[PDB]
């Protein structure tokens, strides 16, 4: 229902640099599972190549930036995309306090192999908290996808 613009396009190319630590425009099989080990799952060689061949345009175990935008905009057109957001909420809000707590958000950042301060966490709240409750809800979370 909602379409992305050149502005939203800059966040994607910018979002691609997290999975593309090489700077060539590829998300290799080993880079995707590195994301899998920080999520709390065991990555297998059968799964790694299986996930890639879904978007992989070349077919060598790497995902490119043109078709990466192809996967998100596809299932985002069924409007039943509410079941997919429940997935982002469980990764952020682990104990389901109904919203996203600062204590759990930190662990997600620290589990990625990085060290951040609480001062930055306040920035996420002003960015997603409408009434400024200090935590992130799913309802606001839904609207956060169409935010520029």
């Amino acid at each position: 229902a909602d379409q992305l613009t050149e502005e939203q396009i800059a966040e994607f190319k910018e979002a691609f640099s997290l999975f593309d630590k090489d700077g060539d425009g590829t998300i290799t099989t080993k880079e995707l599972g590195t994301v899998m080990r920080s999520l709390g799952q065991n990555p297998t060689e059968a799964e790694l190549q299986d996930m890639i061949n879904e978007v992989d345009a070349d077919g060598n175990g790497t995902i490119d930036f043109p078709e990466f935008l192809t996967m998100m905009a596809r299932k985002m057109k069924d409007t039943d995309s509410e079941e997919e957001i429940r997935e982002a909420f469980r990764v952020f809000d682990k104990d389901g306090n109904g919203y996203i707590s600062a204590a759990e958000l930190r662990h997600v950042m620290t589990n990625l192999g990085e060290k951040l301060t609480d001062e930055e966490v306040d920035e996420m709240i002003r960015e997603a908290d409408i009434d400024g409750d200090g935590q992130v809800n799913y309802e606001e979370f839904v609207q956060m996808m169409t935010a520029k």
Partner: peptide, 17 residues
């Protein structure tokens, strides 16, 4: 949250496949 929100949606669609 705006950038790190798009990264989680991609891993959830490739993991449930």
């Amino acid at each position: 949250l705006k950038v790190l929100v798009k990264a989680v949606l991609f891993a959830c669609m490739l993991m449930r496949k």
